[PDB]
């Protein structure tokens, strides 16, 4: 397991943003409360690369992601909007239809790729359990976030940064044998 860090100033933004945002996505009941990170100009896509290999169970559970998934591999350039969710209302609307999860925080591999006063690019690769309101399912996943930093305007004139997500991709995939072993 290796994590990448852009800048050593970005270090405590991994735990602050990623590990709070992930924990708050987990329970789908209170998942509406992620409305705060997204903005009018936000963009979200979802991709699913899970090789099925208990087959009816797998395909019905993976459909929860697939019914929204996007893929331009061999697709007609006109259907390119198919799958692209745009603006905070529309994004949170898709996010509330996804299953409940529990991320395995020990499994997470981080890549902070940009970081300045305007914002950051931050990727996480990990393992989560898909949970039913029928059985448990371990999945592989990636989350990539392009985020901007804006001065929060609390009334104390102390400079503070509010994090906004500009671009957002969830990726669902097979867990690696190593992750399954160590879950």
């Amino acid at each position: 397991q290796k994590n990448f860090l852009c800048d050593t100033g970005a270090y405590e933004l991994v735990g602050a943003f990623l590990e709070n945002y992930l924990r708050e996505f987990e329970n789908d009941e209170f998942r509406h409360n992620l409305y705060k990170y997204y903005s009018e100009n936000s963009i979200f896509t979802l991709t699913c690369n899970y090789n099925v290999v208990q087959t009816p169970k797998i395909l019905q559970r993976l459909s929860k992601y697939n019914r929204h998934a996007r893929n331009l591999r061999n697709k007609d350039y006109s259907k390119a909007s198919d799958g692209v969710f745009f603006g905070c209302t529309y994004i949170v609307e898709i996010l509330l239809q996804l299953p409940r999860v529990t991320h395995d925080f020990h499994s997470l591999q981080t890549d902070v790729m940009h970081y300045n006063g305007k914002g950051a690019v931050i990727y996480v690769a990990g393992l989560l359990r898909d949970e039913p309101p029928i059985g448990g399912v371990l999945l592989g996943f990636s989350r990539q976030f392009v985020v901007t930093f804006d001065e929060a305007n609390l009334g104390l004139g102390k400079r503070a940064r509010r994090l906004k997500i500009a671009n957002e991709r969830l990726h669902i995939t097979n867990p690696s044998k190593t992750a399954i072993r160590n879950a």
């Binding site: 996007r70 909007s81 990539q144």
Partner: protein
């Protein structure tokens, strides 16, 4: 959605497809010229192992075993103005399976951000992750 956002998303999809097709053919079949696709000062992160600047990126690739990539998933978003304004940027993921020389077959997710030198799109960032 808005007829101009539709135009921006669709333009992006064509670029991402042209770029990834040529990119994955260069890594597998012409790794000698792989550096040409990176900006002078790009960031690479191959399984969390960083290489900053083309000179150093261009010697990471020359020290990697020979590869064959099977693509299965392509995704591209155009990046919101504030993330990096005045340079239109694409955020492209490619996922699939890869066969490195003398190594078990593996899965990979590769996520680029690209911008344009003249009429050509090059890498600003590249995060590679192998799985199996």
């Amino acid at each position: 959605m808005d007829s101009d956002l539709k135009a921006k998303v669709e333009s992006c999809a064509r670029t991402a497809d042209t770029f990834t097709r040529l990119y994955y053919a260069s890594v597998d079949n012409r790794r000698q010229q792989i550096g040409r696709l990176y900006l002078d000062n790009a960031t690479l992160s191959w399984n969390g192992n960083g290489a900053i600047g083309r000179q150093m990126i261009e010697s990471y690739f020359q020290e990697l075993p020979s590869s064959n990539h099977q693509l299965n998933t392509l995704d591209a978003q155009p990046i919101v103005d504030q993330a990096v304004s005045n340079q239109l940027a694409y955020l492209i993921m490619a996922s699939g399976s890869v066969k490195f020389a003398d190594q078990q077959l593996r899965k990979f997710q590769q996520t680029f951000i690209v911008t344009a030198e003249n009429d050509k799109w090059k890498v600003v960032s590249d995060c590679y992750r192998m799985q199996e």
